[PDB]
Scaffold this active site. Structure first.
Site, mmCIF file in Angstrom:
data_model
loop_
_atom_site.group_PDB
_atom_site.id
_atom_site.type_symbol
_atom_site.label_atom_id
_atom_site.label_comp_id
_atom_site.label_asym_id
_atom_site.label_seq_id
_atom_site.Cartn_x
_atom_site.Cartn_y
_atom_site.Cartn_z
ATOM 1 C CB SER A 1 -1.101 0.048 1.050
ATOM 2 O OG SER A 1 -1.761 -1.212 1.120
ATOM 3 C CE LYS B 1 -4.194 1.194 -1.632
ATOM 4 N NZ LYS B 1 -3.225 0.083 -1.447
ATOM 5 C CB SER C 1 -4.623 0.709 2.440
ATOM 6 O OG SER C 1 -3.902 1.464 3.407
ATOM 7 N NE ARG D 1 1.556 -1.476 9.835
ATOM 8 C CZ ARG D 1 0.486 -1.380 9.039
ATOM 9 N NH1 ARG D 1 0.603 -1.493 7.719
ATOM 10 N NH2 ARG D 1 -0.707 -1.205 9.566
#
Ligand SMILES: [Cl-]
Lengths: 243, 243
Positions: free
Chosen positions: A48, A51, A96, A228
């Site tokens: 993602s 994007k 996403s 993350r």
């Protein structure tokens, strides 16, 4: 373009029984810091995070008119609930929403997609796969350091697309803001080729400077996905970049 | 109906020992809500909320190149510590840096300023007083509902300046963001003419709607300043707009 390895950040990973890399770039001082120079320069599937250039290209080619155009849900229920609803560019990036982005890529087409990614210097020289699949299935790879170089271009309106396209995408990347800092960023989660990894790439705006970052980490299950952001914020705190 | 009066919120003013108004506007449903239909229509000095039109005008005429241009501190210490440093448009709006904005007003000049505010339909459109101080101690006055009227046009890129000017200023207005909402807004504190007041004006962006707000409260002392945001969020929370 000068670099310091700080193995000391490995502790933020080992704490969670994980492995990964954080790369920071101090813009004012033009200096980089990473826990792992090798992994910082290893190329992974962008999932993602792709994007960001996908957005830029769709805007610049008018595939997407502005950040309010609505992309209606197709009525097929997918297993991520937030996908099963109408989206604009802002909410499509936020959640996403792959199916929206796949439609963008189809309209861009393979020839313009390839040329724009070459203009951006994004990804490996010989990409491959179908236009709505390559950024998912393994046709394109990018390193954390290469993510930073791309984001610094976007920050500075230096990519080969209009200023308007870049401003709109930076608006869409907005993730957090307070009286101390603004973060513009995008998460990724790549599961289709080993090793499964998570991503977080972006920057932190301060009054006086901007810190670019890109991190990836081994992600064998979805259970670790919150790391993350948390591990990146632990490193920003340790480095006194945020409170 | 189009307008609904909710005296319920008056309780947020007195529970924090003050008085004032809140105006809310549902963009999807084209409906308005306030605790005081009367004071909602009452014009006050815009004070630093004037930085929104000022910014727009400065950018559009090219008095300000972009959001990165540096305005150097002149070395004179003023009352507010954060003024005594270099600023760009983003920091100048965050810290409400009057000196930077006066310099803008002087370079815009009386004739362009007057014309621009006429085209913006801004409040009483009256700039009698100093070109570099009218919003502070001059003749211009605006209501909360006229603030919202102006802010709606900005939201939609329908003010008579370039799209770029509007997008840059909306970036500069960024005040808070998280996974729940984005606030773009600007604070005001009017102290030179009675009654002394605080403002907070702007909007709350949600996944599928935008809620414009404009609020003003009595500020006989600088101790209530914090209440500008606090009372608004209290109201926002009660109306189930933010968690
Ligand atoms: Cl923004």
């Amino acid at each position: 373009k000068e670099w310091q390895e700080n193995k000391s950040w490995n502790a933020h990973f080992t704490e969670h029984k994980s492995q990964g890399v954080v790369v920071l770039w101090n813009e004012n001082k033009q200096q980089g810091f990473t826990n792992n120079l090798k992994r910082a320069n290893q190329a992974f599937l962008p999932a993602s995070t792709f994007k960001i250039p996908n957005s830029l290209i769709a805007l610049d080619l008018g595939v997407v008119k502005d950040e309010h155009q609505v992309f209606k849900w197709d009525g097929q229920t997918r297993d991520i609930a937030t996908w099963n609803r109408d989206h604009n560019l802002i909410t499509a990036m936020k959640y996403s929403v792959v199916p929206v982005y796949q439609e963008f890529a189809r309209q861009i087409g393979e020839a313009r997609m390839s040329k724009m990614l070459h203009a951006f210097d994004y990804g490996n020289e010989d990409i491959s796969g179908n236009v709505d699949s390559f950024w998912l299935d393994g046709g394109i790879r990018i390193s954390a350091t290469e993510q930073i170089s791309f984001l610094r271009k976007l920050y500075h309106n230096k990519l080969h697309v209009s200023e308007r396209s870049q401003r709109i995408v930076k608006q869409a990347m907005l993730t957090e803001a307070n009286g101390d800092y603004i973060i513009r960023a995008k998460t990724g989660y790549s599961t289709r080729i080993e090793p499964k990894i998570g991503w977080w790439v972006g920057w932190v705006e301060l009054d006086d400077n901007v810190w670019f970052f890109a991190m990836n980490m081994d992600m064998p299950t979805s259970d670790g996905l919150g790391l993350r952001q948390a591990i990146t914020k632990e490193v920003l705190k340790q480095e006194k970049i945020i409170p």
